[PDB]
Design a protein around this nucleic acid. Sequence first.
DNA 1: ATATAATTAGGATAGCTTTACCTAATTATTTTA
DNA 2: TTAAAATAATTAGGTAAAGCTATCCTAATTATA
Lengths: 118, 118, 118, 118
Amino acid sequence: DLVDTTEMYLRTIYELEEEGVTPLRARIAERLEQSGPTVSQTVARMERDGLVVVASDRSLQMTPTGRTLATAVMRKHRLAERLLTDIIGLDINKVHDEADRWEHVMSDEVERRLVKVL
Amino acid sequence: DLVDTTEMYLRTIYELEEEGVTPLRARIAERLEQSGPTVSQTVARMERDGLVVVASDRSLQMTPTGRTLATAVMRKHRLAERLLTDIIGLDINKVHDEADRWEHVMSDEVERRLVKVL
Amino acid sequence: DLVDTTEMYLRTIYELEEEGVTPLRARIAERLEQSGPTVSQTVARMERDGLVVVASDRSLQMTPTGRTLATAVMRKHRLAERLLTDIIGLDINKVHDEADRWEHVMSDEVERRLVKVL
Amino acid sequence: DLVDTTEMYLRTIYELEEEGVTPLRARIAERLEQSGPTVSQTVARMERDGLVVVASDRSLQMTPTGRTLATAVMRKHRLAERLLTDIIGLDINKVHDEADRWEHVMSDEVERRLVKVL
DNA sequence: ATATAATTAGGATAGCTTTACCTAATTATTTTA
DNA sequence: TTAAAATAATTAGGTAAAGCTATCCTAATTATA
Ligand code: NI
Ligand code: NI
Ligand code: NI
Ligand code: NI
Ligand code: NI
Ligand code: NI
Ligand code: NI
Ligand code: NI
């Protein structure tokens, strides 16, 4: 479960960029282990809510709005990994898949603090 | 957003009992801010999946597995409320509403782990 | 299988009218044994290609274009039943379900003759 | 429209054999007027569904089942062509393209029936 | 070499699902007073 | 007592978000023969 799709599409597109890879639905599908039309369907919804724009080369252009939570998820995701890895002391082989869920329920306030206490 | 529906409906039925209220769809609705037909419907499915039985008095009765879950969610819910308050240091007023979300996203590993560290 | 959905939707909306019933997406889901979301998705498409229009009382209002194939299917449906019932001599118990498929592959060409020969 | 794809891919392979041609996907692509990858991927499903095996020579090997199908469609195809020509008295030039459709929609009952009547 | 004969890569559509929620009416149920 | 106030639930008819398989397609690249 993605806990939240939209956010995992935004986060993924962001990572894809960090990697110098071109964000193409083909990757989001690959990366999220989803069907091609599912991806197309959702990116369509996201495009409608002005979170992303599908370029003329199919590449996915994040709108400034989309880019923002794109970052926030990335931000909380990292924080969760630390919080999990540092203080809670859970197994590192499991810190990601856990933060992968928390990133979608962590609030800005808990974020704002976690950085203060981490 | 309930993050996870089945788990909240369960936690709630387990909360009602804890305070001597007769677990009735009528209450879940008002507790969870949902419509009567929605509630009568989600429950129906919870029954199907064999998590809760709607006894003759019209009361909801958590099957053995249903209860198991109920207790687990509660377990994590309390664990979260603590981790937040104690360590994370989040504002007590908002600690319930965060725990309300984290409870469904927290793993047993982190549970068992938090049981100690916390 | 419906061999052709759009047609079995039009044909259905027509029959419904004949029975003086009000054609609601809910009656198609019924007769066609399809999920509600499906019916809405397809009507959506049918409304996009201009075959039907959804009134303000959810009632489905065919378009003159919709109405025509609506009739044509009905018409080819009747001939197929005769053709099967009369000349081929197939079991009357199975003349419908058969015609239910042929209606969608019977050409005007064959329609025009079948009438002249039946 | 092929009405039923699998069934036309079978009748085609069965037709290629009948005339000596080596059934190769390229052949099906030409006969069915379909793209090369389309043909390659459709034949894959058929393989998975154990209808036809792709021998080393890259040739299409109808499995007993596949064969059984191919022969049925063929039967129906011929039978439909006659009924049209003989009884329906349709224009001999359009008889094939009509039969081409009725084959996938005609039942065995009608099959066995026309076997006599016709 | 060529030609074919197939892939790769990346899409699109039409059809279908189950979850999970909702508004407007009507029936039940209970209890009662 | 015994039928109205509430109380608790259905009915009826949708909605939106997620996902999925079958079918087709256009280029550009590789095999095979
Ligand atoms: Ni990570
Ligand atoms: Ni995630
Ligand atoms: Ni609490
Ligand atoms: Ni919760
Ligand atoms: Ni009929
Ligand atoms: Ni039909
Ligand atoms: Ni022929
Ligand atoms: Ni055909």
